[PDB]
Amino acid sequence: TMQGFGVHTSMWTMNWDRPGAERAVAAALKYEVDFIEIPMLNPPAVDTEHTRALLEKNELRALCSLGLPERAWASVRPDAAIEHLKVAIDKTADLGGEALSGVIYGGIGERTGVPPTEAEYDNIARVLSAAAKHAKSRGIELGVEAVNRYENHLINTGWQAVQMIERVGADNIFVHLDTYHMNIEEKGVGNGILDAREHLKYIHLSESDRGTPGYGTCGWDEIFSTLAAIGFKGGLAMESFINMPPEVAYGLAVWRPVAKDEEEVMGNGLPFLRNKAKQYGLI
Amino acid sequence: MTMQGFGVHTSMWTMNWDRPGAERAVAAALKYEVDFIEIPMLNPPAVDTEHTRALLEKNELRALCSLGLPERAWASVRPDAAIEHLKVAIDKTADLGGEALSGVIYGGIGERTGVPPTEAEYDNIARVLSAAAKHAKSRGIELGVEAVNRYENHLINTGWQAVQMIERVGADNIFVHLDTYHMNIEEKGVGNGILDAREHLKYIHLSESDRGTPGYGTCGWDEIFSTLAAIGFKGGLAMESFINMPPEVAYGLAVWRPVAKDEEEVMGNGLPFLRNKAKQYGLI
Amino acid sequence: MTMQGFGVHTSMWTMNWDRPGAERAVAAALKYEVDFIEIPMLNPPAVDTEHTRALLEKNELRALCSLGLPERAWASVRPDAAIEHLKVAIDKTADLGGEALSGVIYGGIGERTGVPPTEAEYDNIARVLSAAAKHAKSRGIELGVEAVNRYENHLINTGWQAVQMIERVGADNIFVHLDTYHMNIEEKGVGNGILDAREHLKYIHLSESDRGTPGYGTCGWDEIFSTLAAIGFKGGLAMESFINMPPEVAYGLAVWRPVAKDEEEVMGNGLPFLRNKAKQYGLIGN
Amino acid sequence: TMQGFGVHTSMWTMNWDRPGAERAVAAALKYEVDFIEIPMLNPPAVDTEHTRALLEKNELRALCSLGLPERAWASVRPDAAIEHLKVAIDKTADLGGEALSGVIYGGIGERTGVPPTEAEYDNIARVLSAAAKHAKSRGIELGVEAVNRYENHLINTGWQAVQMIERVGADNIFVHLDTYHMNIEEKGVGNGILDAREHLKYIHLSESDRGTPGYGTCGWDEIFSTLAAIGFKGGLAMESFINMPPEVAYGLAVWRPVAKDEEEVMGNGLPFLRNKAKQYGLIGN
Numbered sequence A: 001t002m003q004g005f006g007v008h009t010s011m012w013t014m015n016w017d018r019p020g021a022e023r024a025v026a027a028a029l030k031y032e033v034d035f036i037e038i039p040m041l042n043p044p045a046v047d048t049e050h051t052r053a054l055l056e057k058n059e060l061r062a063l064c065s066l067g068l069p070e071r072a073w074a075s076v077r078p079d080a081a082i083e084h085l086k087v088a089i090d091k092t093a094d095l096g097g098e099a100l101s102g103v104i105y106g107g108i109g110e111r112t113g114v115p116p117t118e119a120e121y122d123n124i125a126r127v128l129s130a131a132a133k134h135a136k137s138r139g140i141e142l143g144v145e146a147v148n149r150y151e152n153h154l155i156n157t158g159w160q161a162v163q164m165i166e167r168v169g170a171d172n173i174f175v176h177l178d179t180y181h182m183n184i185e186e187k188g189v190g191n192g193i194l195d196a197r198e199h200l201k202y203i204h205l206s207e208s209d210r211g212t213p214g215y216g217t218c219g220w221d222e223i224f225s226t227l228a229a230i231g232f233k234g235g236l237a238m239e240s241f242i243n244m245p246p247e248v249a250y251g252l253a254v255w256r257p258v259a260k261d262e263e264e265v266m267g268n269g270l271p272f273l274r275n276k277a278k279q280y281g282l283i
Numbered sequence B: 001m002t003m004q005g006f007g008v009h010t011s012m013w014t015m016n017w018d019r020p021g022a023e024r025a026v027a028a029a030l031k032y033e034v035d036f037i038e039i040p041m042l043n044p045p046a047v048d049t050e051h052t053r054a055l056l057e058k059n060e061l062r063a064l065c066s067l068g069l070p071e072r073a074w075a076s077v078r079p080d081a082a083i084e085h086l087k088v089a090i091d092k093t094a095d096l097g098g099e100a101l102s103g104v105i106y107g108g109i110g111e112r113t114g115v116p117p118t119e120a121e122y123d124n125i126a127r128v129l130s131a132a133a134k135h136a137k138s139r140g141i142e143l144g145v146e147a148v149n150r151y152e153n154h155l156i157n158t159g160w161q162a163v164q165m166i167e168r169v170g171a172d173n174i175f176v177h178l179d180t181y182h183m184n185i186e187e188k189g190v191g192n193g194i195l196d197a198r199e200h201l202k203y204i205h206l207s208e209s210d211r212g213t214p215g216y217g218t219c220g221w222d223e224i225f226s227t228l229a230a231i232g233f234k235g236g237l238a239m240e241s242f243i244n245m246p247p248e249v250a251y252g253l254a255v256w257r258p259v260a261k262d263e264e265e266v267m268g269n270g271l272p273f274l275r276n277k278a279k280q281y282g283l284i
Numbered sequence C: 001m002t003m004q005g006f007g008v009h010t011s012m013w014t015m016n017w018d019r020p021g022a023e024r025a026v027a028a029a030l031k032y033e034v035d036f037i038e039i040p041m042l043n044p045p046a047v048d049t050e051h052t053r054a055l056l057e058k059n060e061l062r063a064l065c066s067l068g069l070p071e072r073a074w075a076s077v078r079p080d081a082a083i084e085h086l087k088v089a090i091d092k093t094a095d096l097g098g099e100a101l102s103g104v105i106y107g108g109i110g111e112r113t114g115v116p117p118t119e120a121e122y123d124n125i126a127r128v129l130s131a132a133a134k135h136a137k138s139r140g141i142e143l144g145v146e147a148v149n150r151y152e153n154h155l156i157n158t159g160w161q162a163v164q165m166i167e168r169v170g171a172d173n174i175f176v177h178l179d180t181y182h183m184n185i186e187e188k189g190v191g192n193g194i195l196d197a198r199e200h201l202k203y204i205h206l207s208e209s210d211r212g213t214p215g216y217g218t219c220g221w222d223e224i225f226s227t228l229a230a231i232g233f234k235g236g237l238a239m240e241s242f243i244n245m246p247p248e249v250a251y252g253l254a255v256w257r258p259v260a261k262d263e264e265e266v267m268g269n270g271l272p273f274l275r276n277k278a279k280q281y282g283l284i285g286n
Numbered sequence D: 001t002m003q004g005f006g007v008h009t010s011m012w013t014m015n016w017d018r019p020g021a022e023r024a025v026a027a028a029l030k031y032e033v034d035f036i037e038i039p040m041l042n043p044p045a046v047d048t049e050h051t052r053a054l055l056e057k058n059e060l061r062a063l064c065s066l067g068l069p070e071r072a073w074a075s076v077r078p079d080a081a082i083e084h085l086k087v088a089i090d091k092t093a094d095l096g097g098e099a100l101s102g103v104i105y106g107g108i109g110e111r112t113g114v115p116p117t118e119a120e121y122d123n124i125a126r127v128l129s130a131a132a133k134h135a136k137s138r139g140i141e142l143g144v145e146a147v148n149r150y151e152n153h154l155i156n157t158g159w160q161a162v163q164m165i166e167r168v169g170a171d172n173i174f175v176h177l178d179t180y181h182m183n184i185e186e187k188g189v190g191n192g193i194l195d196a197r198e199h200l201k202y203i204h205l206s207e208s209d210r211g212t213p214g215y216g217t218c219g220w221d222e223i224f225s226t227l228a229a230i231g232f233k234g235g236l237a238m239e240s241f242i243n244m245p246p247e248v249a250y251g252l253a254v255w256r257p258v259a260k261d262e263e264e265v266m267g268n269g270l271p272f273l274r275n276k277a278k279q280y281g282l283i284g285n
């Protein structure tokens, strides 16, 4: 039921330790967002009580996201993926999060060199069924983020994400789209939204170069008009890679700055997105 | 009006719907393999309804008709004459096998007071459209209200204004008719016209921003088609270009120079572009 | 002229260029840190040039003027009346410190014969603009010819037509003025107007497709800004949004409903957008 | 001097073997393009005089493209890279090709895990200088194609490619842009064209998902307006991986069909692109 505008906290914190959480919440207040997305690079280390109290005091909602580490890629090590996800689901639920989303079906860097196979998808479906039931037991939902061909060869489009949701058969898994990935993957950016429309509950609003929304190659008018047209009432989450911790950035093929500074990205990008949301009547 | 698929406004071959003109237009429709034609009715009384009916039926073609009111019958100021004009056009549309009368049926090209539209004007329009809608209902057809840009008419320029008139009238057989060329000027983001009209949108003119070749101008086609798909549009996708319009009609529409090279450019590049986009975004 | 940087057509802030309106406009221009304002020259005898000049120099603002000709002086058909009107307008522009007189200086906003333009009309215009260009030269200012859409004028609608008139007149102090709202209607791909006009282009109205807030309509801004960067554009970038409507051109401009909530929404959201695009595409001066 | 429209032959054949050359040249003539772009991925395996005969016979021009294999990535193994490029240059010359372009400076799929270093660019520059001399020896030019961050970590933007061209100092190396790559890397697609304007001689007009141009997220009006604005006069080349050369498949990451078939891409994409070139008055159209 995540609604309104939010921010992926990577711009201030990929390490969700005590000072990092305080720093991200502080930013969230400064930009008057409705929610934050909390990356969980190391779920066991998260202080759930601190974060809960922070979200409650500051009347902020949250969800969490991750991508599977290689020791636990679901396509090939599903039992370890289930174990990794159960820990992340519990931490998410305990800190007050409403969903765990992201690359929860695999990891950044998976690539076999040939098309995804039924054996791989079978393993993913088994992992997501296990994890969805655990999520349900803690009262949260799972999100599946479609990412571009280079990061993962399994779920790149909204239509692929929907197929996996159908193969799993749960009711608490939604699609999570990201405009930067859709800019590469969708045959017309609106088609990712169209194909996912029955399951789309969250979208990363990111520019085509991970810099400043409004200043790249994404078709924002098409994106926003199509979200309004399908009655999108889910989470509008700004994602930019500015000020990413270096080794995490290098993991995402950031070889060079995506933008001048946080003042360019947040000062120009959030108003652009909020303005478009008002323009097309998502508010 | 259940009109569906692709069609063409026949102005590229005929603005005078006489006997050879109707045959010329139907011949074009077959060549480009469209599902329906839009028949301009510049002079409704002169239309041979039986000839056109037979032609549509024999060739498996659907149709609607469209018009703008002449000044002697602008509805905002001369509603009684507007009603009389529309009744004749509605009867001719139904009798030729048409499923709707659409267009600038609420006023005319060239209305302008210099100030915002007034409630008195809208009251006269609503009375005309209510009378016309009743008459259309009795003949089994629907009416369409085409939003046009600020310079052609000062009364209905956006999808949201068109929906407000439909609500003011309260009929069930009036729909909205959008035109990408007018939306390109009037809508605050072109998809917003579709969004605002979504509960009433049954027909759209796919026209380029300069009235030339769709795909080669300033209209935002991906937003247009994505948004049509996203609202589940299943109405008429009608191509409109001003290529080869008769001069007098063209001058009345502010065509001061060619909109395109020739029909081969317009139909040969523009129709495939639009069919391709329709398939791309799943309207097909 | 040498106009560079960002400016605003003063309809953003006032309906007429009277003394209180000039006060209100210059004060608003200062809270946005623009480099110049564009002042309508619709009632030349009514402009208090000493008052305006003092305001401009005090607040270190540059200016130019624009107009459309009234029907009594449409150059198409009443060229001698047009020469006289333009001479008065030029003098007032020069007097108040403005650096150019631009816009629809060749005809009316809302001018239309009902038929395509003729050589007789273009010949009259050329004669008027030659005479007007000599008088501008005598007062130290330039003239601009703005292409406007088919519904506002039937004579010059595209960058290519504007350049053809500039080359027909053969003056050296007349430049082309484009407007993205008009190009959105007239140009077969918006960048083509910029390309066609590139050798004479010194000024552009960055106006949204519905005269509203730039960034929130149907104009193709990335194409516009990339093409302006590519041709080396170095002239004025001016906003034009009819928050207020000068009465003498209201009928031709056809703003029958609000273009935007208010001046704060257009300047607060549109100017940053435009400045940010100019910097994104590396526009000379940024 | 490549002018007009051409097609990268992955449109029609996976490998440039003898039957693939015959099938690609036949299709190229059916669509009346001016040139084809031939992958030079296994130089020893190319039958040059067979291809040369086909090209001359069918009044077709050609250039070659490649990415370097890991054994000869210029950034880490510069001497192997020089040797490999000389072999590829000689074969491109022998078959009548007029340039060797693409990722001639590195691998399709090359990544260290960290940003590029000066040591890497120093090696590439040395490689390209030597390669440029030998290309001149055989009378062809070299092209440097910027590719997106996921295929190479070294040259990703028009401005980076120009910086390497200025560093090497050679007269006969041009910049090669790709709209699919610029869709990801350029901060506004036209900026890649603007940044590379002094050296830009070749452009891949490739849709954002490698499918049919005109049916993705590439900003074609911006692309074509800016090309006209800078006076682009070089080659306009389609690139759609209907067929996937085996040696670069892992790096190009085409895991599902980019389009129905080569008829859909050529039948819809090429007229779209020819029509835009005419619309914006591109020199040669």
Ligand SMILES: O=C(CO)[C@@H](O)[C@@H](O)[C@H](O)CO
Pocket (backbone or CB within 6 Å): C040, C066, C067, C068, C102, C103, C104, C109, C146, C148, C152, C179, C205, C240, C249, C253
């Ligand atoms: O864009 C236009 C025409 O509609 C304007 O620049 C000029 O008419 C100025 O408003 C001069 O009055």
Ligand SMILES: O=C(CO)[C@@H](O)[C@@H](O)[C@H](O)CO
Pocket (backbone or CB within 6 Å): D008, D039, D065, D066, D067, D102, D103, D108, D145, D147, D151, D178, D204, D239, D248, D252
């Ligand atoms: O766009 C690209 C790289 O992704 C291609 O031009 C090159 O890889 C050449 O085709 C060489 O294979």
Ligand SMILES: [Mg+2]
Pocket (backbone or CB within 6 Å): A145, A178, A204, A239
């Ligand atoms: Mg994301």
Ligand SMILES: [Mg+2]
Pocket (backbone or CB within 6 Å): B146, B178, B179, B205, B240
């Ligand atoms: Mg229409």
Ligand SMILES: [Mg+2]
Pocket (backbone or CB within 6 Å): C146, C179, C205, C207, C240
């Ligand atoms: Mg203007």
Ligand SMILES: [Mg+2]
Pocket (backbone or CB within 6 Å): D145, D177, D178, D204, D206, D239
């Ligand atoms: Mg390429």
